[PDB]
Amino acid sequence: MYFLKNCPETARNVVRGQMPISGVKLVRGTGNYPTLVLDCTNMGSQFQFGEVGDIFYIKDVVGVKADTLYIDPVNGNNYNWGTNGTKPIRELTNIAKICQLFRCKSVYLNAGESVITSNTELPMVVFEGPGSLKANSGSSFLIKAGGTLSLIGLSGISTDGGHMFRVSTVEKVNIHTNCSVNAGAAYVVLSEVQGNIEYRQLFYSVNCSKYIGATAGQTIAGIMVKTATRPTGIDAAPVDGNVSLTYKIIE
Amino acid sequence: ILYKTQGAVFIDSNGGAAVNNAYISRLGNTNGELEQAVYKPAGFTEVGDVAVTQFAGSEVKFNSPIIEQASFDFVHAGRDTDSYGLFMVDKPHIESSGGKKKHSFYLINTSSNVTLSGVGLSGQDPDLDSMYFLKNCPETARNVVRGQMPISGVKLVRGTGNYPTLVLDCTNMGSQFQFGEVGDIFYIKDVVGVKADTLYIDPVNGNNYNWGTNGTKPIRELTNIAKICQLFRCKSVYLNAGESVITSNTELPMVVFEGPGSLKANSGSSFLIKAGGTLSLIGLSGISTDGGHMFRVSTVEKVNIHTNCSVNAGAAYVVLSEVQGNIEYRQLFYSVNCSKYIGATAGQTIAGIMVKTATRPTGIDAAPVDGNVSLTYKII
Ligand SMILES: OC[C@H]1O[C@H](O[C@H]2[C@H](O)[C@@H](O)[C@@H](O)O[C@@H]2CO)[C@H](O)[C@@H](O)[C@@H]1O
């Protein structure tokens, strides 16, 4: 429907009213700036039968919500909105943007491994489903906003060497992992700021050299590790020297 | 158009057709309510004259119409098959002598974009008359309202069907919270750029038709308080004297509750906590249940429960986490009763507890929570 060519950063291409009844692909473009704005746009059944096309070009959304974002590394299509279960997207590249735009409460991971190869932000929502999350090429998942990130019942989350979650916000961050967690020789959580973090591991298993570390002097953290399958060698020293504990709950 | 029964009727294909600055009026409204629409969609079975009627997929653009003396200003039905046909009315000038009217926008299985121009009214029947009537609009439909609400108080919306579709898009509400009524809050899907600080409740003298956001016009039941606070970003709820009760599990918004009123969960029901934040009960005459757990938490986000009033969960718990929770509970003065302060349905919930009162179940000071809760801090 729209093709946005080299629209400047200050420009806004506002869309109001009702989208067509039949599915359409909304936007494509060229240039480094998003300018499309959904101003209370009545989307109808576009999430189920249409496509966004290129999510990069959407600058802001007002009054348009969806509860869940669906990801399918095997059958998904990135042209999709991803907010309807029959039309999931396939990559993780824009899940943070998409969830922020539509105020999604959860992310659904269909079977298969959802991977990243460069640092990628994760929205602070509930992740569920049979899929797994993998950070490859030394990349890390990024936590940039306060709130709670929950991994519930996934087939697991792991990395090929980089720290698992890099926190760059000073806001309170809760990380809840109720699935298999494997950071290898790295940390589950690395704070790049003077953080305030609460990490909760529930059953399944966890592996890492330290549960939480920080790049610089002190980051307050609270930790609960409820699983026998953990590196017991760090029960006495679960975090690096740059992290001070508020509480520690480990058997 | 000067008419007796129906002003204008638009049916089936009329793509791109426009009707600008139309002046359509019934010749007076005497016995208007008794006219019977002749050409109308199946879903419209009400009696009364209709200035403008549209259905079967017709989508004529109505720009600045002037509609006078009608029982129904507009009756519009989307196409039966897929709800196709947007109801488009921009700045309608609606008036009727003696404030006689049934509905301005009777919308069936459809979407709409309407811009109000600070002109309009709702009829003399305190129960049935409303600006909008939304009949079986589907889940995917949106009936958007922009512009200025009438100066005089009106009842905004009523409807039938299982899905809310009304949207307040930066609607200028004027003094409607104080003098008007929402009608049926259920049909409002969302609200943008319209806020109110407090939601007022009075279990005996309140009226559910009211918005509830102005102190002179509180609502009555607790059923939709979470939804209302969410739509209007309320910071607090004011409970006037009396017992506000629930008999089914009902969500409580995470805001400050104040006033001399009390909260009661009956029929074994529980109050629900579905979002993170802080729920504060400050100075209420108390909160209690007839046997159900007081607060059932179903969110994994950080939840703070601050009770500065009398609390009685009986043999039940003040808080029950239905997920792997993260809760902080603080009881300040007054009194607290329960078998355990916090419990959970399964796999460990973390919590911090502060109980500052001599009137508490002293025998659980050493074991304040059930086996599925692990304490971060305990101050008693
Ligand atoms: O699907 C087309 C249309 O058929 C019927 O409409 C009737 C209408 O009710 C009568 O008042 C008269 O105008 O004849 C029409 C058909 O010839 C359905 O009642 C209506 O819902 C539907 O849209």
Side-chain angles (χ1 to χ4, degrees), chain A residues 1-64 66-102 104 106-251, chain B residues 1-194 196-380:
Chain A
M1 185 172 304
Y2 284 88
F3 187 86
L4 311 183
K5 176 164 179 170
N6 304 321
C7 293
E9 185 174 4
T10 60
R12 298 296 184 267
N13 287 283
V14 190
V15 196
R16 302 194 317 107
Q18 177 190 44
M19 289 286 295
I21 296 295
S22 280
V24 307
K25 168 174 299 192
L26 181 71
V27 62
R28 288 190 53 244
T30 302
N32 314 314
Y33 302 104
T35 61
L36 201 72
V37 175
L38 298 188
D39 180 10
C40 293
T41 321
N42 174 351
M43 306 301 301
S45 62
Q46 285 301 329
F47 289 165
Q48 173 178 6
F49 303 102
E51 296 174 332
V52 57
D54 193 347
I55 191 65
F56 175 89
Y57 294 96
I58 302 198
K59 168 67 173 180
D60 190 25
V61 165
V62 167
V64 194
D67 281 338
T68 307
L69 177 50
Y70 298 81
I71 321 291
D72 193 339
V74 173
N75 306 296
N77 189 323
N78 292 320
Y79 289 156
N80 291 346
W81 281 100
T83 46
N84 175 274
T86 67
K87 276 206 194 288
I89 51 170
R90 94 146 38 187
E91 63 186 18
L92 293 171
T93 308
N94 302 112
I95 73 166
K97 177 182 201 187
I98 301 174
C99 289
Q100 280 152 20
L101 290 180
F102 300 102
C104 298
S106 71
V107 170
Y108 187 91
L109 298 190
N110 281 284
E113 187 179 75
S114 276
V115 319
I116 69 178
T117 52
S118 48
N119 296 358
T120 305
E121 182 184 3
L122 291 185
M124 305 297 272
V125 299
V126 173
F127 280 72
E128 7 150 61
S132 67
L133 290 169
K134 185 66 187 305
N136 283 339
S137 301
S139 61
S140 295
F141 289 101
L142 306 178
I143 287 182
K144 303 191 191 186
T148 298
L149 168 64
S150 292
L151 270 27
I152 301 165
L154 307 181
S155 295
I157 183 174
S158 64
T159 76
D160 68 345
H163 292 302
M164 189 173 286
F165 304 111
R166 296 180 74 111
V167 176
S168 55
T169 169
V170 301
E171 309 264 19
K172 162 60 76 81
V173 162
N174 303 269
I175 295 176
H176 168 216
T177 53
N178 172 227
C179 70
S180 172
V181 171
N182 190 13
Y187 310 159
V188 178
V189 187
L190 180 80
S191 183
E192 308 171 326
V193 294
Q194 296 177 340
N196 184 5
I197 299 159
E198 285 187 64
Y199 170 62
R200 220 186 305 173
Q201 168 70 32
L202 284 120
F203 312 111
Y204 290 86
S205 65
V206 56
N207 186 42
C208 53
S209 62
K210 290 297 178 182
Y211 293 113
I212 302 175
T215 61
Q218 259 46 43
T219 276
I220 56 179
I223 299 181
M224 174 177 73
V225 182
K226 202 184 185 65
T227 176
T229 311
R230 82 188 102 101
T232 48
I234 66 173
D235 281 354
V239 298
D240 76 8
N242 291 331
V243 180
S244 295
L245 299 179
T246 55
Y247 64 79
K248 184 177 83 174
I249 305 171
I250 305 172
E251 273 320 294
Chain B
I1 299 179
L2 259 23
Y3 73 96
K4 180 171 178 295
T5 309
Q6 287 178 280
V9 184
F10 302 93
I11 327 177
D12 223 276
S13 295
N14 281 310
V19 162
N20 306 327
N21 309 290
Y23 198 131
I24 300 169
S25 185
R26 183 169 188 273
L27 195 69
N29 54 27
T30 299
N31 299 317
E33 86 279 7
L34 296 173
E35 299 285 338
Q36 174 54 242
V38 186
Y39 308 96
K40 56 175 205 76
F44 182 68
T45 58
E46 300 295 317
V47 176
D49 67 282
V50 185
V52 179
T53 311
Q54 184 165 235
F55 62 107
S58 179
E59 46 107 45
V60 175
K61 298 186 244 291
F62 297 97
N63 303 305
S64 308
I66 293 160
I67 314 293
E68 315 242 284
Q69 323 305 340
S71 287
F72 294 88
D73 296 285
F74 295 90
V75 166
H76 173 100
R79 183 207 274 154
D80 280 354
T81 269
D82 55 4
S83 312
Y84 174 86
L86 189 63
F87 174 64
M88 293 162 283
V89 179
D90 178 44
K91 305 178 202 87
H93 193 87
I94 297 172
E95 293 177 323
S96 186
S97 291
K100 180 173 173 178
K101 188 157 300 280
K102 308 251 279 208
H103 300 284
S104 288
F105 318 110
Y106 196 101
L107 312 177
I108 302 151
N109 185 27
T110 188
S111 277
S112 63
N113 284 99
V114 169
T115 294
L116 297 180
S117 47
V119 174
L121 65 142
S122 51
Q124 296 299 88
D125 180 324
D127 302 296
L128 308 183
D129 302 339
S130 60
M131 179 165 315
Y132 283 86
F133 185 88
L134 308 180
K135 179 158 185 176
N136 305 319
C137 296
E139 188 176 21
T140 54
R142 296 298 183 266
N143 284 289
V144 186
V145 194
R146 314 185 12 230
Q148 185 189 36
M149 286 289 284
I151 295 308
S152 289
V154 301
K155 177 178 291 187
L156 178 69
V157 62
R158 290 183 55 244
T160 315
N162 305 315
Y163 311 99
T165 63
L166 204 78
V167 172
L168 294 187
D169 187 5
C170 290
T171 319
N172 171 349
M173 305 303 294
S175 63
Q176 295 289 332
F177 290 165
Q178 182 178 357
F179 302 106
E181 292 173 335
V182 53
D184 189 345
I185 194 59
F186 176 89
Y187 295 94
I188 299 192
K189 175 65 178 178
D190 60 84
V191 169
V192 174
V194 182
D197 290 334
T198 304
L199 173 55
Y200 302 81
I201 325 277
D202 187 311
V204 168
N205 318 103
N207 187 329
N208 289 329
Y209 289 159
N210 296 333
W211 285 99
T213 51
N214 178 274
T216 70
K217 285 200 146 197
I219 49 165
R220 192 188 221 253
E221 54 179 352
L222 289 179
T223 313
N224 300 296
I225 69 165
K227 175 191 178 83
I228 293 158
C229 292
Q230 286 159 18
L231 295 173
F232 303 100
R233 323 303 293 268
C234 308
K235 290 166 175 54
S236 59
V237 165
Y238 189 89
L239 298 182
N240 282 284
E243 187 176 78
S244 290
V245 327
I246 61 165
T247 58
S248 305
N249 296 352
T250 304
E251 187 188 354
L252 288 188
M254 306 299 275
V255 294
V256 163
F257 280 76
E258 286 170 334
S262 67
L263 287 165
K264 181 74 186 296
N266 279 342
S267 304
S269 71
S270 291
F271 283 110
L272 310 180
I273 291 178
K274 303 184 168 202
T278 297
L279 168 71
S280 294
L281 309 191
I282 304 176
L284 306 185
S285 293
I287 179 168
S288 71
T289 83
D290 71 348
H293 287 305
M294 183 168 290
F295 305 117
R296 285 179 167 260
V297 182
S298 60
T299 178
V300 296
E301 314 220 270
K302 168 62 68 109
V303 164
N304 295 279
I305 299 170
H306 165 216
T307 51
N308 180 219
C309 67
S310 166
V311 167
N312 192 3
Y317 307 158
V318 173
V319 189
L320 179 76
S321 181
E322 301 177 324
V323 302
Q324 300 176 337
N326 181 14
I327 296 156
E328 289 184 58
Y329 165 60
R330 64 184 193 275
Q331 168 73 27
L332 282 97
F333 314 114
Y334 292 82
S335 75
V336 60
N337 189 46
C338 58
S339 55
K340 292 293 188 192
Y341 293 108
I342 308 178
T345 60
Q348 234 59 17
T349 276
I350 53 177
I353 283 181
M354 176 170 89
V355 184
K356 197 177 187 72
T357 175
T359 311
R360 61 172 197 272
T362 261
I364 67 174
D365 283 5
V369 301
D370 80 359
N372 302 320
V373 177
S374 294
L375 294 186
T376 50
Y377 64 79
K378 188 184 75 180
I379 300 170
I380 303 174

